[PDB]
Amino acid sequence: GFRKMAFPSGKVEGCMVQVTCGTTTLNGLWLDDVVYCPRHVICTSEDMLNPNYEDLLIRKSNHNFLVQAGNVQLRVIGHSMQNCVLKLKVDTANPKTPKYKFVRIQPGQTFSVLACYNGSPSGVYQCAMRPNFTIKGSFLNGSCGSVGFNIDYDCVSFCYMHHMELPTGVHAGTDLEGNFYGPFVDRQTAQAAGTDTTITVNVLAWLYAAVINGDRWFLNRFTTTLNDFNLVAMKYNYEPLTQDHVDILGPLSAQTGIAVLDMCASLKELLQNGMNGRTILGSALLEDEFTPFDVVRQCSGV
Amino acid sequence: SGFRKMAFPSGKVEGCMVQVTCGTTTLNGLWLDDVVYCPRHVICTSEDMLNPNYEDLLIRKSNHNFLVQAGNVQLRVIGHSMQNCVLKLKVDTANPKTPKYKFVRIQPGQTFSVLACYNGSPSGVYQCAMRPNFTIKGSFLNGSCGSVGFNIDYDCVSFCYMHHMELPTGVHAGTDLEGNFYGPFVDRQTAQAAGTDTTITVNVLAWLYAAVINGDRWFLNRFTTTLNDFNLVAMKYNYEPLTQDHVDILGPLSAQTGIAVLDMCASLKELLQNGMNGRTILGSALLEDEFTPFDVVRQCSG
C-alpha cells in the first residue's frame, strides 16, 4: 500500500513548550537551553496590524516571557531576535533534546508537521513545500510555532516553523533561523502567493513507484533532453527540473533500469495526450507530494 | 483552516516498542509494565507457518528461546503465555515509559493511528480506518508484524490493533490486543480473501462537510431526500446504511455549515449516480471514507 506517512513524532514532542507574552500565547521549540518561537508572540492583537518588532522587543526583558513545559515554568535568562524568530535562553537544558540540525528545504521537499496547541502536541501529518512556498496544512488559532521536520537515522532536521494562514487557506512560515519561505511577512495583512505549479520531480518519483509495482503502460519508447523537457513542462504549469532533481531520482532510475530522461519523455507524453481514462497506481490523478526519498522509504522500510 | 489526514502523536507508543526474536523469526512487540505483547507466529519456523499447531509449538518453547531487545538492552523473559493470537512474554523489568493505557476493540468505520515499526524501531505513523469487511488499508512491509494501532484521549492510549498479515489484494489484517482477529482471517501462511468491502457512508458525509467548511461547494444541490430513500441508493452502490445515530453524530457539522444532514445525503446520492465529472473534492478524485465525524470536528472546530 501507498500512504502519506509521517515520521514518528516522539523526538519532537519532547521539545515542544508554550511561550506567552501578556495574553499572546503560542508554541516554542526547546533544544538544549534555548527555546525558539515566532517573534509575533511579543505583539498584542492590535500590535500585529503594523508591528515594529525592534521597537516592541526593546521594551521587553527576560522577565516578561513565560515559558512552560506543561505546567512547569522555565525561567528565561536571555533573549534575542534572529529574523522572524525569537530565541529565549532558559536555565534548564532539555534532557529530551535529540540529535538535531536546522535545514532550509527546497520546494518539493516533504516534511512531517507536529501541530501543537498550548505547547501540547495534537496531531502529526505530512506536508510538501509547494513551488510557491506555501504548504497545504491544517492549523487553527494557537498553532503558531508548530514545527516541520524530517528524521534521518536518529537526527532530527527541523525545516519549518509555522506563522501564518493566507486568505486562500494555505499556510506560510519560516525556517528555524527565522527566514520566511516565500515573499511573506509576519504582519496582520492580506498577502498573496504566486500561482502554484506541479512538482515535477515528485510526479516522476510516483511514476517510478508505479513501475516498481508492475504498472508500466505509460512507458513510451522515446527520450528527451532535459532542456526540451523543461520548456515543455512549463507550458503545463509543471516545474522545471534541476540537476539536483536528476540526481535524487538516480536510485529509482537504477532500481527500474529506466533512464531519468526516458521517464521524462513518458511524462511528457502523459501531459500532451492525457490519461485517456486510464489510471496509475489506482488514480486518474498524478501525485506530486511523494519525493523520491518518500518512495524509497515507504517501499523499503525506515 | 485546512483539512489533512492526521495521526495522533506517536511518542507515547514509541516508548513501548521492542524487538522480539525466536529462532530465525523477528518482529515487533509492545512492552507495557512488565509484559511484552507480540504476534504468536514469532514462534513459527517458515515450515511451521504453513499449518501451525500453536499450542504444540508453544509448549515446546522455553523462556530462553525468546530474545527481547529494547534498544541496546536485552530484557530477560521470565514467563510466557498465549492469549488467542497474541503471545505474552513476562520480563523482569517494568517499562518506565508505560503510558496510561487500555485495550479496546474498535468498530468498523472507526479510525486509529498506526505506528509502523521494523526490528522494534518506529518507522512511520499514519491514520487508518477499520473497514466494514474488517481489513485495513495500511502500508506494511516484511518485519512489520507487531506494529500497533491506537487512539489517544487526553493522556490515555487505547490500543486497538496489532498487525499480522497482508492479504493477496494488498490490504491488511490483524487482531485486537486480546489476540482476536478482526474479520474471518487466521494466522496461517495461506491466501485469504475478505468479504466484499463497502464504503463508510457516515464518514463520506463527514468529509463532504469538511469540504464545505474549507470552501469546496460545487457538489451541493437544492434537493432533499428521506433517510430511507437515501439508504436505498446507498445500498445499491455498496455503501453502508446511514442510521439515525449517524445522523445525530453529524449534527455539529450540520449546525456549523447550515446544511441539513439529509440535504448532504441528497448531494451524496447525486455524486453516486453521476460521478464527479473529472472534478475533485478536497484534492481527491474519489469519495474519501476514512475521516470520522469526530476527526472532522476536531480538526475543523472554529
> Quick check: B4 and A140 CB within 8 A?
no
Query: What own/partner pairs with CB < 8 Å and gap ≥ 24 does B66-73 have?
Result: B66/B20, B66/B21, B66/B22, B67/B20, B67/B21, B67/B22, B68/B18, B68/B19, B68/B20, B68/B21, B68/B29, B68/B31, B68/B36, B69/B18, B69/B19, B69/B21, B69/B120, B70/B18, B70/B19, B70/B31, B70/B95, B70/B120
3-state secondary structure chain A: CCCCCECCCHHHHCCEEEEEECCEEEEEEEECCEEEEEHHHHCCCCHHHCCCHHHHHHCCCHHHCEEEECCEEECEEEEEEECCEEEEEECCCCCCCCEEEECCCCCCCEEEEEEEECCEEEEEEEEECCCCCCECCCCCCCCCCCEEEEEECCEEEEEEEEEEECCCCCEEEECCCCCECCCCCCCCCCCCCCCCCECHHHHHHHHHHHHHCCCCCCCCCCCCCHHHHHHHHHHCCECCCCHHHHHHCHHHHHHHCCCHHHHHHHHHHHHHHCCCCCCECCECCCCCCCCHHHHHHHHHCC
Considering the candidates B16, B22, B38, B41, report the single residue annotated as catalytic.
B41
At B185, list the grid cell: 482471517
Residues of B with CB under 8 A from a CB of A: 1-12, 14-15, 115-116, 118, 121-126, 137-141, 143, 170-172, 214-215, 278, 280, 283, 285-286, 299, 301-302
Nearest to B44, CA basis, from B60, B55, B57: B57
DSSP state for residue B170 in the 8-state scheme: S
Give the domain-ending residue among B170, B197, B224.
B197
Q: What is the CATH number of the domain that holds B50?
A: 2.40.10.10
The experimental resolution of this structure, in angstroms, equals: 1.7
Phi/psi at A199 (5° precision)? -85, 95
Q: Whole-angstrom Cα distance, residue A169 to residue A193?
A: 11
At A98, list the grid cell: 535529540
Both A86 and A206 in one domain: the answer is no
Return all residues near B178 (Cβ < 8 A) that are at least 6 apart: B83, B84, B86, B103, B105
Nearest to A40, CA basis, from A189, A157, A148, A215: A189
Contacts of B123 in chain A (CB under 8 A): 8, 301-302
Nearest to B43, CA basis, from B65, B29, B64, B22: B22
Nearest to A162, CA basis, from A253, A33, A41, A291: A41
Both B186 and B224 in one domain: the answer is no
Phi/psi at B270 (5° precision)? -60, -45
Query: What is Dmax (Cα atoms) for chain A?
Result: 69
Cross-strand pairs, A24:
A21
Both B5 and B135 in one domain: the answer is yes
| 3-class SS of residue B206 | helix
Domains of chain B: total: 3
Is A245 a residue of the active site?
A: no
Considering the candidates A37, A84, A144, A264, report the single residue annotated as catalytic.
A144
At A97, list the grid cell: 533534546
| 3-class SS of residue B182 | coil
Both A150 and A107 in one domain: the answer is yes
Pairing of strands A34-38, A76-82: unpaired
Give residue A136's domain range: 1-13+99-196
Q: Whole-angstrom Cα distance, residue B172 to residue B147?
A: 12
Contacts of A3 in chain B (CB under 8 A): 126, 137-139
Q: Whole-angstrom Cα distance, residue A5 to residue B110?
A: 19
Is B145 a residue of the active site?
A: yes
Q: Whole-angstrom Cα distance, residue B169 to residue B165?
A: 11
Distance, C-alpha B88 to centroid of its chain: 21
Residue A211 vs residues A12, A214, A220, A295: alpha-carbon distances, Å: 35, 5, 12, 12
Distance, C-alpha B159 to centroid of its chain: 10
Q: Whole-angstrom Cα distance, residue A157 to residue B174?
A: 34
CB atoms within 10 A of CB A152: 12
Residue B218 vs residues A132, A234, A255, B213, B297: alpha-carbon distances, Å: 26, 29, 42, 13, 21
Contacts of B126 in chain A (CB under 8 A): 3-6
Cross-strand pairs, A134:
none
Query: What is Dmax (Cα atoms) for chain B?
Result: 69
Nearest to B18, CA basis, from B82, B87, B81: B87
Both B114 and B52 in one domain: the answer is no
Q: Could you tell me how many helices (H) and strands (E) chain B has, helices first?
A: 8, 13
What's at A182, amino acid-wise?
Answer: G
Angle, alpha carbons A68-A73-A74 (nearest 5°): 90
Nearest to A204, CA basis, from A151, A270, A282: A270
Nearest to B122, CA basis, from B71, B175, B162, B68: B71
Determine contact, residues B127/B94, Cβ cutoff 8 Å.
no
Cross-strand pairs, B87:
B38, B82
Q: Whole-angstrom Cα distance, residue A147 to residue A37?
A: 10
Residue B190 vs residues A41, B87, B164, B166, B184: alpha-carbon distances, Å: 59, 21, 13, 10, 13
Q: What is the CATH number of the domain that holds A261?
A: 1.10.1840.10
Cross-strand pairs, A150:
A157
Both A125 and A163 in one domain: the answer is yes
* Ranges assigned E (strand) in chain B: 17-22, 25-32, 35-39, 66-70, 73-75, 77-83, 86-91, 100-103, 111-118, 121-129, 148-153, 156-166, 172-175
Q: Whole-angstrom Cα distance, residue A161 to residue A144?
A: 7
Both B41 and B182 in one domain: the answer is no
At A76, list the grid cell: 528565561
Determine contact, residues B194/B165, Cβ cutoff 8 Å.
no
Both B104 and B184 in one domain: the answer is yes
Q: Whole-angstrom Cα distance, residue A145 to residue A20?
A: 12
First to last CA, chain B: 9
Phi/psi at A79 (5° precision)? -150, 150
Phi/psi at A105 (5° precision)? -90, 165
Broken C–N links (> 2.5 Å) in chain B, after residues: none
Determine the residue of chain B that is closest to A114 in CA distance. Answer: B9
| Calculated CA dihedral for residues A245, A130, A205, A221, nearest 10 degrees | -80
Segments in B117-260 forming alpha helices (H): 201-213, 227-236, 244-249, 251-257
At B73, list the grid cell: 538492552
Considering the candidates B22, B38, B128, B145, report the single residue annotated as catalytic.
B145
Both A204 and A145 in one domain: the answer is no
Distance, C-alpha B50 to centroid of its chain: 26
Give the domain-ending residue among B139, B171, B197.
B197
**What is the radius of gyration, based on Cα positions, of chain A?**
22
| 3-class SS of residue B62 | coil
Both B273 and B124 in one domain: the answer is no
Distance, in angstroms, between B62 CA and closest chain A CA?
Answer: 31
Give the domain-ending residue among B72, B99, B126.
B99
Determine the residue of chain A that is closest to B213 in CA distance. Answer: A169
Which residue matches cell numbers 500565547? Answer: A25
Determine contact, residues B126/A6, Cβ cutoff 8 Å.
yes
Both A264 and A202 in one domain: the answer is yes
Phi-psi region at B55: left, alpha or beta (left = phi > 0; alpha = psi -120 to 50)? alpha
**CA atoms lying within 13 Å on the CB side of residue A99:** 5
A-B contacts (CB, under 8 Å): 112
Q: Whole-angstrom Cα distance, residue B16 to residue B31?
A: 5
At A122, list the grid cell: 495534537
Both B252 and B118 in one domain: the answer is no
At A59, list the grid cell: 521594551
